[PDB]
Structure formats: structure tokens, C-alpha cells
Amino acid sequence: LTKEIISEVQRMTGNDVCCDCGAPDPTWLSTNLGILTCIECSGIHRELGVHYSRMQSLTLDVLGTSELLLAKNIGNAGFNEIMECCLPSEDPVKPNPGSDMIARKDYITAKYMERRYARKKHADTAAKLHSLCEAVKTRDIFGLLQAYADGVDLTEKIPLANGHEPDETALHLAVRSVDRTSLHIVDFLVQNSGNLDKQTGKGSTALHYCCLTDNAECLKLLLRGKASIEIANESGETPLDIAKRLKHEHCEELLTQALSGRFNSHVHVEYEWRLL
Numbered sequence: 001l002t003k004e005i006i007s008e009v010q011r012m013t014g015n016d017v018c019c020d021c022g023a024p025d026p027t028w029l030s031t032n033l034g035i036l037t038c039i040e041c042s043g044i045h046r047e048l049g050v051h052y053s054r055m056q057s058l059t060l061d062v063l064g065t066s067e068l069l070l071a072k073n074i075g076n077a078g079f080n081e082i083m084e085c086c087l088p089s090e091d092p093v094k095p096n097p098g099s100d101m102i103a104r105k106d107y108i109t110a111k112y113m114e115r116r117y118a119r120k121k122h123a124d125t126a127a128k129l130h131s132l133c134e135a136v137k138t139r140d141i142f143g144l145l146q147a148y149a150d151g152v153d154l155t156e157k158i159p160l161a162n163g164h165e166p167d168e169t170a171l172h173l174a175v176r177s178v179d180r181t182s183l184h185i186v187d188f189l190v191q192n193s194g195n196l197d198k199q200t201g202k203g204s205t206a207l208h209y210c211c212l213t214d215n216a217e218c219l220k221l222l223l224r225g226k227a228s229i230e231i232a233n234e235s236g237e238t239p240l241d242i243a244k245r246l247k248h249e250h251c252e253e254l255l256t257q258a259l260s261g262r263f264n265s266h267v268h269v270e271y272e273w274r275l276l
């Protein structure tokens with residue numbers, strides 16, 4: 001299963017060269033970005049910290065299918081189309097397979113931390129948030145990626161007109177609007193948001209939302225991201241309380257596992273991998 005998704009990921013057009021230096025056959029995956037790098041560039045990404053890039057060997061390490069949602073939907077070509085859109089013209093800034101560590105470090109820092117080569121699309125804040133909102137509603141992963149390239153705050157409230165509760169973020173919206181074909185939209189937000197605990201005007205966190213609709217797959221992504229299970233909504237309920245009350249067994253079992261400090265390592269989720 002995971003092996004079949006990995007071979008698919010490796011065969012994606014553009015995934016045959018390291019995202020950052022061109023080295024052939026990259027095998028290191030940045031799970032929150034859906035891209036593949038050579039081992040050398042991989043070493044620099046590790047230094048950036050999990051708030052920027054979470055590395056794992058695609059062919060050597062054991063992975064939960066949930067960690068391949070982004071790899072399956074993004075890929076080097078698509079990612080670089082946005083992140084290297086403004087790479088210098090007559091100034092060969094991008095490292096090549098023979099480049100030293102100092103050179104990869106300077107480029108990788110500028111590319112990912114500074115976003116020096118990304119296409120800055122939107123005319124700031126207001127626009128950025130609106131595009132993020134639309135990207136989620138249309139389930140467009142590259143639209144989410146662009147918002148992230150523009151440096152949008154993924155945890156900020158979005159200009160949503162008919163939200164379920166006031167002050168929803170893109171994560172609240174994503175959780176209640178994605179399905180088996182679009183879990184990766186929720187995943188992108190979970191792996192690139194520093195705070196998965198934002199609350200609606202009624203104190204609801206994305207976890208609460210998951211329990212209200214018995215969305216166990218989104219719930220699994222959130223727990224993997226260590227969203228806090230003890231935050232209560234304005235009525236005093238925690239997500240576990242909601243799950244019990246509505247009798248949503250799967251959600252109850254998952255939250256109870258987490259509550260007892262025994263939650264899953266390699267998190268698998270039901271998704272339309274389309275590997276037939």
C-alpha cells in the first residue's frame with residue numbers, strides 16, 4: 001500500500017530530480033511540502049526546523065499513508081513552479097548536484113525561509129486571506145501553496161460569508177468541507193500551521209468540528225499534529241464530550257487513545273489514492 005503510493009510518488013513527472021539542486025533520483029521527502037530532495041539538501045532542510053520542513057526518507061523510512069498525502073498531490077515540478085518562479089535570470093543561483101554544503105545552505109535558506117524566489121502573487125493581507133479561503137472551497141492544493149508562498153498566516157480568520165460559526169480559520173472550513181478525495185487540503189493546513197487550536201467565536205477548535213460531523217480521518221490528522229484535545233468550547237464541551245454524546249464511536253476511540261497517551265505512530269487515513 002504505502003509502497004505502491006511511494007512508487008507512484010517517485011514516478012511523478014518532475015520527481016526524478018532533487019527539488020533544490022537537480023541531483024537525480026531524490027529520495028528524501030519533506031512531508032509538509034510534498035517535495036523530494038537528495039540527501040545533501042535534505043541535511044539543510046533538517047536544520048530549518050519542523051516549522052519549515054519535516055524530512056523523512058521515502059525509500060528507507062517507515063511512513064503512515066497520512067504522510068504521503070502531500071507528496072501525492074504536490075511534487076517538485078508543481079512546487080517549484082511557484083517557489084522558484086522568480087529564480088534569477090543571468091545569475092545561476094540554484095545549486096547543482098556538485099555544489100558544496102555552504103552553497104546549498106544559502107540557497108535553501110533563501111528559497112524556503114525567505115521565499116526569495118517565489119512568485120509573490122497577491123496584493124497583500126486582505127487579498128491573501130481571500131485567496132486562501134477560495135483555495136480551500138475549491139480544493140486547490142496549489143492555491144493553498146500560493147497563499148503559503150505569499151506568506152499568509154494560515155491560522156488567521158478568513159473572509160467567510162456563511163460560516164458555521166463566527167471567526168473560522170481555513171482549518172475549520174477545510175475540516176467541514178473536505179472528503180475522501182480532498183483530505184490533503186486539510187493536511188496541508190495541519191502540517192504548516194503553528195497553532196492547530198484556533199477557536200471560533202463559540203470556542204470551537206477544528207477537533208470539535210471533527211466530532212460534530214464524525215470526521216475521523218480529519219481527526220486523525222489533527223491528533224498526529226498534536227492539536228490539544230482538552231480545549232473546551234463556550235458550552236464547556238471538549239471534543240471527547242461531543243463524540244460520546246453523539247455516539248461517534250470512531251472519534252471517541254481515537255480521542256480516548258490520545259487521552260491515554262497511546263495514539264498511533266504511523267497514521268493511516270482513508271483516501272482516494274487512485275492506485276488501481
Ligand SMILES: [Zn+2]
Pocket residue numbers: 018019020021022023037038039040041042
Ligand atoms: Zn539536492
